Design a protein around this ligand. Structure first.
Ligand SMILES: *[C@@H]1O[C@H](CO)[C@@H](O[C@@H]2O[C@H](CO)[C@@H](O[C@@H]3O[C@H](CO[C@H]4O[C@H](CO)[C@@H](O)[C@H](O)[C@@H]4O)[C@@H](O)[C@H](O[C@H]4O[C@H](CO[C@@H]5O[C@H](CO)[C@@H](O)[C@H](O)[C@@H]5O)[C@@H](O)[C@H](O)[C@@H]4O)[C@@H]3O)[C@H](O)[C@H]2NC(C)=O)[C@H](O)[C@H]1NC(C)=O
Ligand code: RX4
Ligand code: NAG
Ligand code: NAG
Ligand code: ZN
Length: 598
């Protein structure tokens, strides 16, 4: 009978969760070893342990059918059993699962090993993306130099992996269907537990898109003054290599060229960090201080002992894209980051530390619940603090910003600088998954896969490649998360909800009042705020024990993902920008790109 079975099921879950945490520990150590040190031997070891855990999860999913779990009284036990039925890739036949794993590692190791020749010295052929190629893209204003690096990089990180990528789409689809999702798109969307999730994101994106078009128009206008009309046209998509980032996903590296008031301060503290003798270790201690300042949890010793916080000196291959790692024990959490002493890197340290914090906050939950309320909550945590750290308020406290006068013009420069990261990214992130979803769904023929990518980047972001591409190229895997099979919607969701969290944390801190000119949202510093830290503790400590609207509610009492907060933060910029574009007769919008030949 059911009453007795439900008591037995509770003990069954308590043991199984512990066993899964322990088996996942072993798989995570192998994945960490390989990401830290890419070799044939560590590849084998990573993929072999994974295959062994996949076999066990098949057994678990089969054993869940012995329990009448859908008939139980406890919503909590039913939620745990539902989590165990979800096998993902482990639903695949043994041989197909091993093949998918060898595919994933071939792509991610391809990405991690790309090197290109110096533009000025064809003899020097060891420039990696991080840091050598990113340094040119962020700093050079030689448009031909920029196009050279763009093309070398995309050809090596994108095109070289087309056949592996094709086989990955096939096996990802096969797995999704063994789980009875229509495709990998639906499997990814299942993490949000909301069957109107895509529509909700279309609606929010539609509300913020007019602001994006204004920033896009003003930036193109400023780039025409800098490079001239032979390089940038008034009416076409912006050539992406001029935007200071290899994927044009954030434009803040060109702020010194597009800032609304060039004779007024523009915050860039990298040179003061270097002058003060900052190191990667100090930036991480800094991040640690900020979370502890809010009454949140200090980094444990294993973090300091076992983290990799600067790029190795030896000549060994590895993955430099930054990552944060839960080993599913107690306090065994770590970061691997190729720390560089720059303003943007100070934000990236706090982003990674936000994941680590959420690990420490939920580590007492059963293993199935030790993950974010939805993937976007995991990405938002550290960005709430980064939003605070980026303020002239904070940066003056830590001595990194000197002789700053925050008048109306400086305020516009700062809001615009923030927008070049936070608003510009929204169409970018949406397209990373609209592209992969349309491949997963079978909506694009293989003959049209490259131009389908560039057509989305054009339609949504109004950017295009520096040179003509065709179906002979394959550019999408040139983005880390596409080669590494990491879902990207979590970041679009994060960039919307991180404003809901920031606004609420600022109000709780006494740092934001919409009716007080002295407390504007865009200069709020939540450093030292126990009240903001309490709201974080209340939410993060839940892990995935409840549907995410319950976790949002634990933070601020709301249950709805909403673009109200991000619009409120940027509303002074919107008013100023619309007027400035009219004042300057700035053309808005763009004609269809000519850069991808079908
Ligand atoms: C994705 O969707 C798939 C369907 O598209 C689904 O696959 C189905 O899963 C069913 C298992 O739930 C499975 O059902 C069994 O069918 C057996 C015989 O089927 C054969 O002939 C089929 C068609 O006629 C062929 O296509 C198959 O390949 C088969 O070879 C039945 O013998 C079997 O029965 C037993 O179990 C039922 C269920 O019992 C439940 O639990 C308790 C037990 O305590 C019951 O009292 C309770 O009420 C509940 O019924 C018993 O009632 C019965 O007495 C037997 O013990 C069962 O019906 C089905 O065959 C299978 N395929 C298809 C095409 O239908 C996948 O599981 C889905 N995947 C995921 C991950 O969700
Ligand atoms: C082991 C793991 O999945 N860790 C996650 C954090 C988590 O979800 O628990 C993580 O490191 N996630 C990192 C990306 C990554 C994802 C998957 C594997 C390897 C790396 P990140 O989000 O912290 C990296 C960060 C610099 C990032 O990618 N930001 C976006 C906006 C970008 N495109 O740069
Ligand atoms: C990298 O892995 C190899 C074997 O794959 C191992 O011998 C070596 O010690 C590792 N290198 C470093 C620097 O850890
Ligand atoms: C610090 O956090 C704990 C809970 O982790 C709480 O009990 C304590 O009262 C908090 N401190 C302050 C100053 O609110
Ligand atoms: Zn992240």
């Amino acid at each position: 009978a059911l009453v007795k079975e439900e008591i037995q099921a509770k003990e069954y879950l308590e043991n199984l969760n512990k066993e899964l945490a322990k088996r996942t520990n072993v798989e995570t150590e192998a994945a960490w070893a390989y990401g830290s040190n890419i070799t044939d031997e560590n590849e084998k070891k990573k993929n072999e342990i994974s295959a062994e855990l996949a076999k066990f999860m098949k057994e678990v999913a089969s054993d869940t059918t012995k329990f009448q779990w859908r008939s139980y009284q406890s919503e909590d036990l039913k939620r745990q059993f539902k989590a165990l039925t979800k096998l993902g890739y482990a639903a695949l036949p043994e041989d197909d699962y091993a093949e998918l794993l060898d595919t994933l590692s071939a792509m991610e190791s391809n990405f991690a090993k790309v090197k290109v020749c110096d533009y000025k010295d064809s003899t020097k052929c060891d420039l990696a993306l991080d840091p050598e190629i990113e340094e040119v893209i962020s700093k050079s204003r030689d448009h031909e130099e920029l196009a050279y690096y763009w093309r070398e990089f995309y050809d090596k990180a994108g095109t070289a992996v087309r056949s592996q990528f094709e086989r990955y789409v096939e096996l990802n689809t096969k797995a999704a269907k063994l789980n009875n999702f229509t495709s990998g798109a639906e499997a990814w969307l299942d993490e949000y537990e909301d069957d109107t999730f895509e529509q909700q994101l279309e609606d929010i994106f539609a509300d913020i898109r007019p602001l994006y078009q204004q920033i896009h128009g003003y930036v193109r206008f400023r780039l025409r003054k800098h490079y001239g009309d032979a390089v940038v046209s008034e009416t076409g998509p912006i050539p992406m290599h001029l935007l200071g980032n290899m994927w044009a996903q954030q434009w803040s590296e060109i702020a010194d060229i597009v800032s609304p008031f060039p004779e007024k301060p523009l915050v860039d503290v990298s040179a003061e960090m270097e002058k003060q003798g900052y190191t990667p270790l100090k930036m991480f201690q800094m991040g640690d201080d900020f979370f502890t300042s809010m009454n949140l949890t200090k980094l444990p010793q294993d973090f300091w002992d076992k983290s990799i916080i600067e790029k190795p000196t030896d000549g060994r291959d590895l993955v430099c894209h930054a990552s944060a790692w839960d080993f599913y024990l107690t306090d065994d959490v770590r970061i691997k980051q190729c720390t560089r002493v720059t303003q943007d890197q100070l934000f990236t340290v706090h982003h990674e530390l936000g994941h680590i914090q959420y690990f420490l906050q939920y580590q007492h939950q059963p293993f199935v619940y030790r993950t974010g309320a939805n993937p976007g909550f995991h990405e938002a945590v550290g960005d709430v603090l980064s939003l605070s750290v980026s303020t002239p308020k904070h940066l003056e406290k830590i001595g990194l910003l000197k002789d700053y006068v925050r008048d109306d013009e400086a305020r516009i420069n700062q809001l615009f600088l923030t927008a070049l990261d936070k608003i510009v990214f929204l169409p970018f992130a949406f397209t990373m998954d609209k592209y992969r979803w349309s491949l997963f769904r079978g909506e694009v023929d293989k003959a049209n896969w490259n131009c389908a990518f560039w057509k989305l980047r054009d339609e949504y972001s109004g950017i295009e490649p520096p040179v003509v591409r065709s179906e002979k190229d394959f550019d999408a895997p040139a983005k880390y998360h596409i080669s590494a099979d990491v879902e990207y919607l979590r970041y679009l969701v994060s960039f919307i909800i991180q404003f809901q969290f920031y606004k609420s944390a600022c109000i709780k801190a006494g740092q934001y009042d919409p009716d007080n000119v002295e407390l504007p949202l865009d200069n709020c510093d939540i450093y030292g705020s126990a009240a903001a830290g309490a709201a974080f503790h209340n939410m993060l400590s839940m892990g995935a024990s409840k549907p995410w609207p319950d976790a949002l509610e634990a933070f601020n009492g709301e249950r709805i993902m909403s673009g109200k907060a991000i619009a409120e933060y940027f509303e002074p910029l919107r008013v100023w920008l619309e007027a400035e574009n009219i004042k300057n007769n700035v053309h808005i919008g763009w004609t269809t790109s000519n850069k991808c030949v079908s």
